[PDB]
Amino acid sequence: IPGRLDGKVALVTGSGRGIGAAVAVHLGLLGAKVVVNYANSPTHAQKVVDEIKQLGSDAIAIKADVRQVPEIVRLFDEAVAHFGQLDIAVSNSGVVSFGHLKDVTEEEFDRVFSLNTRGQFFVAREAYKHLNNGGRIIMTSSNTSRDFSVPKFSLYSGSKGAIDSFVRIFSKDCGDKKITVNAVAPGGTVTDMFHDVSQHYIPGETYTPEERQKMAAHASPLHRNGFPEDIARVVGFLVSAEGEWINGKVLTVDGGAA
Amino acid sequence: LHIPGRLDGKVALVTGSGRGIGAAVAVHLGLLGAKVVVNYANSPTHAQKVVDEIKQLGSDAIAIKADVRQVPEIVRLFDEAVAHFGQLDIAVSNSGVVSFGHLKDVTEEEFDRVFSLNTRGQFFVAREAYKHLNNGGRIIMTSSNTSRDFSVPKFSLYSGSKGAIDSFVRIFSKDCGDKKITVNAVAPGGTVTDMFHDVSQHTPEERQKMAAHASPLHRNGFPEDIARVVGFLVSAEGEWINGKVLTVDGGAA
Amino acid sequence: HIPGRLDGKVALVTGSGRGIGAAVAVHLGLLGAKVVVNYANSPTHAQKVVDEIKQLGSDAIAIKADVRQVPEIVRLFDEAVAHFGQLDIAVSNSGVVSFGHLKDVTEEEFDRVFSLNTRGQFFVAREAYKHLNNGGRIIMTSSNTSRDFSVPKFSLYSGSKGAIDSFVRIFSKDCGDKKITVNAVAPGGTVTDMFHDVSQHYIPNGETYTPEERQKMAAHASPLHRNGFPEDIARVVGFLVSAEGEWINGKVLTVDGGAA
Amino acid sequence: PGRLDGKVALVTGSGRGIGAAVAVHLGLLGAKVVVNYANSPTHAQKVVDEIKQLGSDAIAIKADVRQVPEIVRLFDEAVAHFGQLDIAVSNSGVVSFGHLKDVTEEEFDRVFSLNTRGQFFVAREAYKHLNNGGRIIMTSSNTSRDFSVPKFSLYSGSKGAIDSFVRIFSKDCGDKKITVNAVAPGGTVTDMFHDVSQHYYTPEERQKMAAHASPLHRNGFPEDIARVVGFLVSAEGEWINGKVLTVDGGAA
Ligand SMILES: NC(=O)c1ccc[n+]([C@@H]2O[C@H](COP(=O)([O-])OP(=O)(O)OC[C@H]3O[C@@H](n4cnc5c(N)ncnc54)[C@H](OP(=O)(O)O)[C@@H]3O)[C@@H](O)[C@H]2O)c1
Ligand SMILES: NC(=O)c1ccc[n+]([C@@H]2O[C@H](COP(=O)([O-])OP(=O)(O)OC[C@H]3O[C@@H](n4cnc5c(N)ncnc54)[C@H](OP(=O)(O)O)[C@@H]3O)[C@@H](O)[C@H]2O)c1
Ligand SMILES: NC(=O)c1ccc[n+]([C@@H]2O[C@H](COP(=O)([O-])OP(=O)(O)OC[C@H]3O[C@@H](n4cnc5c(N)ncnc54)[C@H](OP(=O)(O)O)[C@@H]3O)[C@@H](O)[C@H]2O)c1
Ligand SMILES: NC(=O)c1ccc[n+]([C@@H]2O[C@H](COP(=O)([O-])OP(=O)(O)OC[C@H]3O[C@@H](n4cnc5c(N)ncnc54)[C@H](OP(=O)(O)O)[C@@H]3O)[C@@H](O)[C@H]2O)c1
Ligand SMILES: Cc1ccc(CC2(C)C(=O)CCC2=O)cc1
Ligand SMILES: Cc1ccc(CC2(C)C(=O)CCC2=O)cc1
């Protein structure tokens, strides 16, 4: 069936919440067995797992802090040990930071890069090691990587610039087990990371999340916000057999937003 | 069992859909449950075989002859399209021509032969799609990995013609906003068609065999490798990809 | 000590009677190059620019030529070598702006814009290759609205220029066989009549405000809180067409001030 | 006209390669120059002498630009010694070769610590110490985006960060009229280049074959890169701001 992952096994970093959980649920709905990674949210992780079973697929929830390379090896090893194999691996887990360059401390740089940049690099490494031939790797970026220059968004933005460079090359290295590497580069997607940002990137903590959401709904010429489900559908296609001939590319899923 | 990206009750139009990538897109949209207008200019034989193929898998279709180099023919194309199927939801600009030659030997005639179809015709094919399309609709334009990624010698004219398209789709996506119509491009790499064979010179299948190893996946691009990306984009699920050139080259260098 | 001068060199700038072309031409003159000031409709300003270049101690001429007519481009490049003996540098600067929603764009309008902005630039670049000294320089002019900024009702202009970008990448390869560099400059918000006619539309109400008012408003858009001036682009161009600019070859440079 | 009289510039790793070319070029153009080394004081001394030789002043300052504390001292001592600083070139980098499967946490940390994190904080300390209307230059690679070389994923990543950095840095440094740009060198003949012509014969034999990458049929030398930095950091380069300039002479 076009678009489906029946008999495929997937892993998603940070799939208890946000775009993570919509991806896991969508791969599940598409036919794949889902390994749902969290670090701080076992409760929402279990809801995602149960939601996937309710629709007919299988899922488990493994805790692992993807800032820790040993916990990533354990994450993938345990994935393989439980479902038998891994076809698909979506590096989703990341954090936002906001600040003028003059006020960025070492501690803020390392927090962001450990997860966004370094953590995803090793999620990709262990993905290649653990993946069936024909498999899929997805990494997660930002339209603030190349397309939008928000002031005081340097640290986060470069953390993702590094992801764009990695995928192009990764798709070369990974071709030797016929694994395709792409990133998705979401724009404003309604999650707690979006609401934490809109507050700092609008003249401005005095507006309800609802109203910053309505303001940003205008940036899109479709007159709406992006949603986890929007980015999930694009990851779904990429990780299908039909999305094969997209390789080494970065897809921006923002809606034509300005 | 959930079936993604299906186009039942939708009508698609695909310029240049009797031969090559176009024919694969027409059929692919036909497989995903779209009624299809198959445009041709010179290949009525081929266009009919395409119309046939799409009825075969249980969707409706018609061939329409039209020179997308002629704006009056573009108007009449989209008119007949709406006359027959009563609506159009998806318009795909595929029709294109290749050119090869050092800037020094390029003529006014050769520039105009290429930009007439691959740039101007595509822009008016999109203008008529915006006017004839329904809200929630889909415009898809065709480019080339040569537009920006790859700098192949003696390929200026052609890569020019498509670089215009990359700019068009970004701005169009804002314009087509007021009918909630999304505009994107597919930028194919070397895809196995008559055109690829025409310019694998710069043993049709021997030169093909060379090109298999440019992609890390060690195989050529085939017309259906692009069709399936068009399929996702002109689905509901593709909506949040907008004003974006997708390069479909397999990772080719 | 004295970097990126153009002494002994000859340059041709298209549409160097007004705006960017004029300051480009003056800059290359400032830098020691003799300058062919092309124009199509502005012959008196073309002469003021020649006199300004002559006045700062170089030589220059004004040649009428419509870069929409290719034989007028061949004739332009012929006359320029006939008059100065040679040509090292060729700046494709001539273009027009168009505002309009796809729905309202006409054949006559599309052709108006593409014939000067694209076809024209292409053939300036063709005759430049043919007429130019080895080690020479070709520059074409794009816009930051070609890839960087997506502005509504700006499809036709933006596309006319996106072609320009693709062209300079491949032109660099073709033109390599005479050790000629081809780059482009993408200006963004440069105070000229083109900018004033564009601020009218891309501004909350537009004609309600003087052109200075709209200008003063655009100044905030830049991290350097000022507008772009033609001199800002002429400076980048002067580097590119210098001997020292050589290892920039095949790129589009965006000279917008870091602006949005 | 492109000159730097009364200006002071700092160049990280300007003892060797592109750096020294840049340090020597900013001197040629009238800048006084702080020459930063971490490992190579003997070359650093050569560069200071050369800049004294052509009629500008200079000083060598040891600082490992992996330690942020040593970046702080370097910039403090620079404003100490010359009593201002206009221009700051983040140059110091390293190269890494390996399939994604083979890359270790220690290699990534050796690469990012200097190429990405180090440069990030040189730019912070550049902005904190720099005069108004000043210049920050950072350093990438045509491998960040334009070219995709098997087994180059770490180096390219390290430098793709940099491209995003300079874009936003240009906005933040807009309160002190400071422009921020990266040059993205291609194959430039230095100690790092001979290192990976091997992995990707004699050096001269690998240089001769690399000369054909460019449509100008030349391999690329420090002076090529240094010229473009000289322009960006001159008054005339002001309108180039927030941009990645790829100096590969059109190569490959
Ligand atoms: N506007 C946007 O939403 C937007 C835009 C561009 C890019 N992105 C990217 O899209 C991806 C998803 O973000 P989101 O918006 O969904 O954000 P989100 O709601 O903040 O969710 C963050 C996710 O990251 C996980 N996570 C955090 N720290 C972790 C750690 N040390 N180890 C493992 N997992 C960790 C969280 O799980 P725990 O709860 O288990 O910690 C959570 O699942 C991110 O990579 C983000 O950078 C988002
Ligand atoms: N390597 C590749 O295949 C490749 C790579 C990059 C981009 N592309 C692009 O993909 C598109 C399809 O090309 P292809 O590769 O499939 O080429 P192809 O085999 O040459 O097919 C050309 C198609 O264009 C139609 N066409 C030609 N002139 C026309 C006109 N005046 N009016 C209407 N239709 C016309 C043809 O129909 P008639 O025969 O009936 O005229 C035919 O269906 C083109 O835009 C091309 O630039 C292809
Ligand atoms: N200003 C901006 O903000 C901006 C932004 C992006 C790009 N640009 C580009 O910058 C370049 C110059 O723009 P501008 O702003 O300086 O424009 P401008 O003030 O409008 O001047 C237009 C120039 O075009 C020349 N021109 C027009 N038609 C011509 C023809 N048939 N043949 C020869 N020359 C012709 C004009 O000369 P005549 O009077 O002699 O006809 C004049 O020199 C153009 O390439 C433009 O697209 C400008
Ligand atoms: N060379 C190329 O072909 C090429 C291509 C693309 C990009 N680049 C970039 O160009 C820049 C210059 O490279 P290159 O080719 O000149 O390389 P190079 O020959 O290897 O030179 C290395 C320079 O880096 C300095 N350095 C190294 N580690 C340092 C540290 N911890 N702290 C301070 N300084 C340090 C060195 O100083 P000590 O010896 O004193 O340590 C030396 O001056 C680099 O950023 C590189 O990534 C180069
Ligand atoms: C060096 C080279 C040049 C052209 C092709 C084929 C193809 C696909 C393009 O890349 C543009 C259009 C077209 O025919 C393949 C390899
Ligand atoms: C944010 C923005 C950037 C560019 C434009 C168009 C452009 C490039 C022109 O051609 C006229 C002036 C000018 O800014 C409009 C708005």
Author numbering:
A (entry chain A): 10 to 212, 214 to 268
B (entry chain D): 8 to 209, 218 to 268
C (entry chain C): 9 to 268
D (entry chain B): 11 to 210, 217 to 268
The paper states:
In this study, an anthrol reductase (CbAR) from Cercospora sp. JNU001 with the ability for asymmetric reduction of various bulky substrates was identified and characterized. It belongs to the SDR superfamily and shares the highest sequence identity of 86.6% with 17β-HSDcl from Curvularia lunata. Similar to other SDRs, the overall structure of CbAR monomer contains nine α-helices and two sets of β-sheets (β1-β7), in which continuous β-sheets and seven α-helices constitute the standard Rossmann-fold motif responsible for NADPH binding and the C-terminal domain constitutes a substrate binding pocket. In both of crystal structures of CbAR-NADP+ and CbAR-NADP+-Emodin, the catalytic triad (Ser151, Tyr165 and Lys169) is well observed.
Indeed, CbAR-H162F, CbAR-Y210F and CbAR-Y210A variants could enhance the catalytic activity towards 1e, with 44.7, 4.6 and 3.2-fold increase, respectively. To reveal the exclusive stereoselectivity for 2,2-disubstituted 1,3-cyclodiketones by CbAR-H162F, crystal structure of CbAR-H162F-NADP+-1e complex was successfully obtained and refined to 2.75Å resolution. Its overall structure is very similar with CbAR-emodin complex. The “gate” region (from residue 209 to 216) is visible, but the conformation is different. Importantly, although the electron density map of 4-methylbenzyl group of 1e was unclear, probably due to the considerable mobility of the flexible benzyl groups, the 2-methyl-cyclopentane-1,3-dione part of 1e is clearly observed and well localized to the active site of CbAR-H162F. Notably, we observed that only two of the possible four binding sites in the crystallographic asymmetric unit are occupied by 1e. One carbonyl group of 1e forms the hydrogen-bond interaction with the amino group of Gly197. In addition, it shows that the 2-methyl group of 1e orients towards co-factor NADP+. In all, these observations well demonstrate the exclusive stereoselectivity for 2,2-disubstituted 1,3-cyclodiketones catalyzed by CbAR-H162F to deliver corresponding (2S, 3S)-ketols. All of them could be efficiently converted into the corresponding (2S, 3S)-ketols (2e–2i) with higher than 93% conversion and 99% ee by CbAR-H162F, whose conversions were better than that of wild-type CbAR.
